[PDB]
């Protein structure tokens, strides 16, 4: 049972990475479950979006004053 | 019969092929209702709605096959059916989409909407149908440049993509007519005729 | 219900599905679980299995020496041509199979969807090889007749045909070779 | 576990820093974040996968869009989730169009 959600935890993370790949979003697998999953404990979705973005953003600034 | 019971057999309808209390009536050359799962005329019209798509496609089916087994009606009426085939396969992969939905919520409204685009493009087919048939040769591409002088980016594009394939075929025989002035046409439908 | 009507496609006729030699690929129609038209796509279907039957009879008989019919390299190098055309549709097959096998729902229209390619390709060469069969044309007649047929329109069964027919005048070129 | 553990430890990853590190980053997130905990639209797949495809059109992207309403049928195939809907409007926020020029028509 357990070894089955497991199964199930990989595929529905394939399927994701898949339609992340497809959407060309440029999000990382570390955003595998740990991004979805967050949000999954009921978080607002658009400001989690919102969140993302910041992050996103800091990150970009980030790194290129780094560079 | 239940609203599901119809969407299973719209499910079989799309792909032209009609259902259990659904069946592809000759009087309207079109899927008339086994009237026989009675039920509101609201749901009746809505798939009376959907009957184009039945029509249509099995129009297409007709039709390509037709010109598909000629082999002396036009090698370009046999790429025009080539085409009218790769754009039945996307269709085919709709249908196929839907049937796996139909396996295991959605709605008939859900269907309809998902399924006006798919009528866009079929409409455009059949139009592109009907208003092509007897041109072969330079008829055929005088149609097939012809047809193109409507709007419509998406119908723009698909006919667009319809006929520069068509154009390939025009194109190598002016390439040999052009390249080594070599003219085998069988049917003489080039626009340079050829005296042997 | 996936994998025997694959099985019956493959030439290898199922329970359900009725290979009849004259009838073609027929279908005993007393199972559940679709519709008439579902099998009527399915009969669709059963006529490119019916043809590969029939195929794979004549690729068979024309792969032998003392009988009347067409002889010679050319026979078995059509027989050739044809299996190794039917390669790409094995490995269609075989590649839909492990798609089937790895989808829970994978529905037998995705199964026709994957298919229509090879159903596209397919009954051109069926009617060239019947009218080939019709000519009984030997020697390099039936090199002939393809090259008539070399200026195809459909786009697989004409890259197929060039295929065939590049395998046949190389067979061409060797004899000359030999006469050289 | 905790929500605020995981806000954290994404924050160490998306900074590719520490949680010290991203406190004030970290900071400004969590008010964002305690500004709304729960979405104000509701979840109805059927609009953002018409939403989906028609961001991928207007990337001229048919091909792609039929590729992802495949994965959407193997995935809803799939189901394990009840709120699936935020998930896919996460996507669409973080999907990017490197196959598109940057130049857009203002939808309503």
């Known amino acids: ?67 | 019969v239940t609203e599901a019971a119809l969407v299973r057999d719209i499910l079989y309808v799309f792909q032209g092929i009609d259902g259990k209390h659904v069946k592809m009536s000759n009087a309207d050359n079109c899927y008339t209702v086994e009237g026989k799962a009675n039920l509101s005329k609201s749901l009746r019209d809505t798939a009376v709605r959907l009957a184009e798509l039945g029509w249509l496609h099995n129009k297409i089916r007709k039709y390509t096959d037709q010109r598909s087994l000629d082999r002396s009606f036009g090698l370009v009426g046999q790429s025009f059916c080539a085409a009218l085939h790769q754009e039945l396969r996307e269709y085919y992969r709709l249908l196929s989409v839907l049937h796996s939905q139909l396996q295991l919520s959605l709605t008939l409204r859900r269907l309809l909407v998902w399924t006006y685009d798919p009528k866009m493009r079929l409409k455009t087919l059949a139009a592109l149908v009907d208003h092509c048939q007897g041109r072969k040769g330079g008829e055929l591409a005088s149609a097939v440049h012809a047809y193109t002088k409507t709007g419509d980016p998406y119908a723009r594009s698909l006919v667009q993509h319809i006929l520069s394939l068509v154009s390939h075929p025009v194109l190598s025989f002016l390439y040999r007519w052009i390249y080594d002035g070599e003219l085998e046409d069988t049917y003489h439908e080039f626009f340079v005729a050829s005296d042997p | 219900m996936i994998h025997e009507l694959l099985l019956a496609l493959s030439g290898y006729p199922g329970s359900i599905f009725t290979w009849n030699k004259r009838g073609g690929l027929q279908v005993s129609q007393d199972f559940p679980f679709l519709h008439p038209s579902e099998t009527s796509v399915l009969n669709r279907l059963c006529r490119l299995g019916t043809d590969y039957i029939r195929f794979t009879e004549f690729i068979e008989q024309y792969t032998q020496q003392g009988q009347g019919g067409l002889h010679g390299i050319y026979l078995r190098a059509f027989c050739t041509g044809l299996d190794s055309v039917l390669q790409p549709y094995r490995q269609a097959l075989l590649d839909l199979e492990q798609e089937f096998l790895a989808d829970p729902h994978l529905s037998i229209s995705h199964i026709n969807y994957s298919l229509d390619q090879f159903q596209l390709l397919f009954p051109s060469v069926m009617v060239v090889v019947e009218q080939i069969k019709s000519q009984k044309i030997h020697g390099c007649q039936i090199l002939e007749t393809v090259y008539k047929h070399s200026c195809g329109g459909l786009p697989p069964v004409r890259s197929a045909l060039e295929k065939i027919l590049a395998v046949c005048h190389g067979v061409m070129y060797k004899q000359l070779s030999a006469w050289m | 576990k905790s929500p605020n553990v995981l806000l954290q430890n994404l924050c160490c990853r998306i900074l590719g820093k520490s949680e010290a590190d991203v406190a004030q980053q970290f900071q400004y997130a969590v008010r964002v974040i305690g500004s709304n905990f729960a979405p104000t639209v509701e979840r109805d797949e059927f609009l953002v996968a018409e939403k989906i495809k028609k961001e991928l059109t207007r990337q001229r992207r048919e091909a792609d869009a039929a590729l992802f309403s495949e994965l959407h049928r193997k995935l809803h195939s799939q189901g394990v989730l009840k709120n699936k809907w935020s998930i896919l409007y996460l996507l669409l926020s973080l999907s990017e169009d490197p196959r598109k020029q940057p130049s857009k028509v203002s939808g309503y």
């Open chain 1, 1 to 67: 049972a357990a070894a089955a959600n497991l199964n199930a935890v990989r595929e529905t993370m394939d399927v994701l990475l898949e339609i992340s790949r497809i959407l060309n979003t440029g999000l990382d697998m570390e955003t595998l479950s740990i991004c979805v999953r967050l949000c999954e404990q009921g978080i607002n979705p658009e400001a989690l979006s919102s969140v993302i973005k910041e992050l996103r953003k800091a990150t970009e600034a980030l790194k290129a004053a780094e560079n």
